């Protein structure tokens, strides 16, 4: 009640000043309120009296443009500023030259904060409540915010004061300054060290970006260049050949007989996602992922050494929810993962529904059309449909994973934002990746010979794939998710404030930096996720197609700048923190390279169908088996196809058929044979080479691991001379 | 010169009193010495008289037993101890209900060495050449050492000491008392932590061996009962059916055919160790290694909380050899390299010398002989000569290591250490490793069909194996080497003490403890490569037979009582020091985890010859491809064998020949055949079936590791909870 706040002086002499109406003392927060009312301005004016007594100094301004609304610029004194930074341990290289400026105003701002976090408001209804963010909770106060240097755009009146936020804007955040390179120093000076941290990891993650892009469009062009001399990709479409193969039809009942004729384009656009240099790739890719994470983590700890970001912590207090709320914590954890299946089993549902209407599209299509094929149309309205339903179905449980924590009990802001992003991580990943994962792996490996079909359902046989394999329409739906979500997210963020830009064409400090959208909570949560998809997007699946990385990379870049101007011109100025690495986005991370290698391998042999041409290259084409007397190629397309007598195990084809042998693309014995349909000896030749194949790169993919994590210093050499010198400077 | 140290009272009023001649204050240092001459006289007083001008307190006493020999007890005043303890920053809970008793002797004798090390001598020759350990490696300084409380046999004259060393010998250290438990904590508080985390970690081991043994023995037992059921080892030696098989010979000229008869007793014996106990074993093994290291690593946090081990280190003063001698730094590693390589290819060389004998003795034991095959008996002498070789080669190596590493520049000596441990073990890992390696991955895998065998010098053929497979002789080897190594050990040393003790039936402390050998400077390394290599043995080969654990256990169990006696009745005692874990052995045993796992995969698939039983079971008893109406093992012997109809790609076979088809142990076509001698097709799906169960074994292995890791919590919640209680009291 007693020891209220100077009343509002606003003088507003200036629209940036910086300081007090003496203009001597820096403002260090701004809290704006606008005057059941009664009792919480009672409430408020001893939140106020409390502050003034713990040493801040306050003095509130009327705004001008609204009356009801004032603002309380609140500064701390040094006395109170040391004794609470040797409080929170922040420590210093000293350089007393200004007290003023011996502080950047973002450690004043952070310790500030901290004050009012740790005091109380005099409330007895609860035995101690206290904290400012209760406030701002509770609505008694409009704001809390911290207040930028100046306009982005306008250089600041003083002169004394750097134009921080202008400097960034104009060297670092302007939508046409791409050539420049980012100034973290800068960046963490201003904005915290979280922000700086996470800007520093983009940034090494778009250098890594570039380099596997590099490799990759290397690799692509070896690729392309060598379409001329593929061989069996002319053989699928030579008409006295790949005319006369007859092969059976996929369906059951409606889809006629068709030849290899009609699959030339798709084989001669195969012919260069397949080839040998995709397999070096994905060797490559293992090899810079496993060198990436240790290479990010060495320059995590050069980062941790520079900013000094393992500073003492606080005891992080509770969340407002939690202890205004507080084995029923055991149930609730029960709750939530039944929840969280519960969506991940409706993302299966998705993709079986996609699976279904792939099937009756591709029905469809044969009748309609007498170019594309049928399987490629198929296959990209497939695939379309399935980013649209991504979409959607991502925007829907965002909101449903915020409504789920809340019935979960998070202790802390740390424990809400690790389990949200367990759970949010989790999904997207189940989403995206098995809508990929059906097509790469379970596509039309179980499907049996089409004398007896399998049924999965009893309705529909589960869909075999062309002979050239699954490959090109996995790198379909790869290309169409990561096109769809890149071209959205990067037209949005950049041409919608481009637009705005062009239907352009006194005010104080505080109130100008009002009219600003606060960060929110979580912060750069959503960019963290969005990165680490596209991330397992490259890692992946980077064998499916090279130019993976190149057009990430591209996105990429922008998507460094579009932050930038995000977090200059679009947002409130946010408390600085401390922050590790990333958080739990690194284990996850981590997890994401485990699983990658081991995904490249079955990529390249179960789903890329190279195995079998180097299998019928190296042994069957030999007089032991082939009638070639050297190794070759050739004929491979006519002695892997199998054959099929006309008899059905019903004989759904008879309807539609014109003649007696149907060649399937499976490797078993021909109709007349001690064992009919049985596997051939060629299959398991396969089979032994893929396991050995996928036996051989994994454990040469660890071990190359095993040994750059060995052999590379984890610190570098200059980080441990600086240490030494720091620490010897430290001893004297 | 001057400050003499008061000249030996030599009074030896008591043979045990732990004080000076006043009886007032500890002895905290013994330093004897006896007395060109002179001038190490003067630079010994010089020594002397620093010491003493320091604040260390000092006195000398003369030799009962020689005169020339002169001890000098060392003691420390509070002051001085207290500010070198503040200097070296070892914390306490205080009590100082006596200033002596608040200070452990321990940590009196340890802060004394500190102090010991970090005073100067007083020698301008060179410039500021320091330390304690340089006079006793001088020789002017006979010896420097910390004192026992009292005989280990008998109690201690003072009631106010408590009798520690008898205390230890009559509880934990009796080569009779074995039902006793460690009590780690008076192994911490006395001869300081290392040895203590060693004890610990020993202890641990012997746990986890413990378990591991009864599982095994389980497994064992199950193999063993079940050798009844067991169907092709009834076959291969019933006369009608295996004594009408007639299989080629395995060496070139001299070997006759051989039925395989003569092959029962082994065929019975290998049926208790390849049976599914054995792969139940196997993998078993797999997640106790994968959940034991994550369990000491557990119990190595709790230590360290326990014990606070990471108490911050000095400097870590550099080697007196290092400083006395100081990119020639890289070409001396270079030379180290060149000659460990040197080394590890003379034990590759002993491997195949090792070879070349099994051949010879082989082709000598066919003639010789008419119980035991001569296959056996060549294996259990090719055994028995390995076993002796490595004993000598590592008695060489240990001596051309320590040589080496003098070669080499070590910095400080836990550089010295480092190296020592990396070469050692190295060394060591290669030879043991790699003689059991050969028999069990590339003993008979790469051997073509007797038409065509393959010459691998021109001379020899490699050597096949029997149908069972190389499983017997892997587990012989690893058996033979195991027990011998055991055995010598122990053997030496428990009876040849225990012999000495039966061969039996004043003087002060000083002296007393001075006819003791000094423990040496790498301390416990021995003992720790030694168990690492059991551990290794206990591990990489586990699959090959299940009583690996058990016999270790046996041993382990003597070996820990034997340190602690030898550490108490026999080595003066050592200064205390403060150890983290291990140092590298925990790197060591991680990484052989690692390899284990998939080198247990690997036995179980490519040596133990079961796959091909479970696939000729659940496929090759079939209509499809055998006559059997349901599945069943019987007929494998003969179904499985190939033939040979006698051509010899010469004819070396027709010398001792009798007949015409001959069947050799593979799986390729009969002779009379479009694909004459090829692999059958029966031999593809059996390598998928083993590729495959590597994948899924390796998978699922690695899979339940990372699900452990992240699951059990890293620190127990009880060490969470001492910790938050003592930081709550001490911030109040």
Redesign the interface.
């Known amino acids: 009640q007693d020891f209220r706040t100077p009343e509002f002086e606003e003088f507003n002499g200036k629209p940036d000043s910086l300081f007090f109406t003496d203009g001597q003392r820096r403002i260090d927060f701004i809290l704006v309120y606008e005057d059941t009312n009664e009792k919480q301005k009672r409430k408020r004016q001893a939140y106020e009296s409390n502050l003034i007594c713990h040493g801040l100094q306050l003095e509130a301004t009327r705004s001008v443009s609204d009356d009801k609304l004032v603002f309380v610029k609140v500064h701390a004194p040094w006395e109170v500023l040391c004794t609470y930074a040797e409080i929170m341990h922040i420590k210093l290289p000293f350089y007393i030259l200004d007290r003023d400026s011996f502080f950047n105003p973002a450690t004043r701002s952070r310790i500030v904060y901290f004050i009012l976090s740790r005091v109380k408001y005099q409330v007895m209804n609860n035995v101690n409540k206290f904290g400012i963010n209760r406030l701002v909770s509770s609505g008694i106060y409009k704001a809390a915010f911290p207040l930028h240097d100046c306009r982005f755009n306008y250089e600041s009146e003083d002169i004394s004061c750097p134009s921080e936020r202008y400097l960034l804007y104009r060297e670092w955040a302007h939508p046409r300054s791409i050539y420049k390179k980012q100034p973290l120093d800068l960046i963490r000076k201003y904005y915290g060290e979280k922000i700086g941290i996470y800007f520093a990891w983009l940034g090494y993650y778009t250098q890594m970006l570039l380099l596997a892009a590099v490799v990759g469009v290397a690799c692509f062009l070896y690729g392309y260049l060598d379409q001329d001399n593929c061989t069996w990709s002319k053989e699928v479409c030579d008409p006295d050949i790949g005319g006369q193969i007859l092969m059976c039809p996929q369906c059951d009942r409606l889809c006629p007989f068709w030849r290899l004729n009609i699959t030339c384009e798709s084989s001669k656009k195969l012919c260069i996602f397949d080839s040998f240099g995709t397999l070096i790739f994905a060797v490559f890719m293992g090899v810079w992922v496993t060198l990436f994470l240790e290479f990010w983590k060495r320059r995590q700890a050069e980062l941790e050494y520079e900013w000094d970001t393992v500073e003492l912590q606080q005891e992080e207090q509770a969340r407002p929810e939690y202890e205004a709320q507080c084995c029923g914590k055991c149930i609730r954890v029960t709750l939530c993962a039944s929840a969280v299946f519960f969506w991940i089993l409706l993302i299966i549902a998705s993709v079986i529904g996609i699976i279904v209407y792939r099937l009756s599209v591709f029905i469809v299509f044969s009748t309609t059309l007498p170019y594309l094929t049928p399987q490629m149309a198929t296959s990209i309205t497939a695939s379309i449909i399935s980013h649209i339903i991504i979409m959607i179905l991502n925007t829907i449980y965002e909101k449903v994973a915020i409504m789920i924590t809340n019935f979960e009990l998070p202790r802390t802001q740390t424990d809400y934002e690790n389990s949200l992003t367990m759970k949010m991580f989790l999904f997207q990943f189940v989403n995206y990746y098995s809508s990929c994962f059906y097509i790469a792996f379970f596509k039309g490996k179980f499907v049996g010979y089409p004398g007896d079909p399998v049924y999965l359902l009893g309705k529909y046989r589960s869909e075999e794939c062309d002979p050239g394999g699954c490959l090109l329409e996995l790198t379909t739906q790869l290309t169409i998710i990561m096109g769809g979500k890149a071209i959205w997210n990067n037209i949005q963020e950049v041409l919608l404030p481009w637009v705005m830009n062009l239907i352009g064409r006194i005010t104080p400090r505080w109130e100008q930096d009002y009219h600003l959208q606060p960060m929110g909570k979580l912060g750069l949560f959503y960019e963290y996720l969005e990165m680490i998809i596209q991330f397992g997007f490259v890692t992946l699946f980077v064998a499916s197609f090279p130019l993976a990385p190149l057009l990430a990379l591209v996105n990429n870049i922008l998507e460094i700048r579009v932050d930038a101007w995000k977090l200059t011109t679009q947002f409130r100025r946010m408390v600085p923190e401390k922050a590790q690495d990333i958080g739990a986005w690194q284990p996850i991370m981590q997890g994401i390279a485990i699983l990658a290698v ?1 995904t490249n391998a079955m990529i390249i042999a179960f789903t890329s169908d190279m195995i079998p041409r180097l299998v019928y290259y190296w042994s069957f084409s030999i007089p ?2 082939g009638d070639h007397t050297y190794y070759t190629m050739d004929g491979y397309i006519n002695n892997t196809l199998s054959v099929f007598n006309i008899t059905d195990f019903e004989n759904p084809y008879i309807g539609l058929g014109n003649y007696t042998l149907c060649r399937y693309r499976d490797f078993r014995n021909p109709p007349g044979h001690p ?1 009919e349909y ?1 596997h051939n ?1 060629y299959y ?2 396969v ?2 080479a893929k ?2 194949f ?2 051989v790169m ?2 040469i993919i660890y071990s190359v691991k ?1 040994f750059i994590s060995y052999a590379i210093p984890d610190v570098s050499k200059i980080t441990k001379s600086k240490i030494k010198r720091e620490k010897y400077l430290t001893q004297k």
Do not use: G, S
Request: charged share 10%; glycine share 0%; proline share 6%.
């Open positions: 081991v032991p088996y064992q049985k000896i398991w030749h089979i032994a396991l050995a996928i036996i994994e454990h095993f």
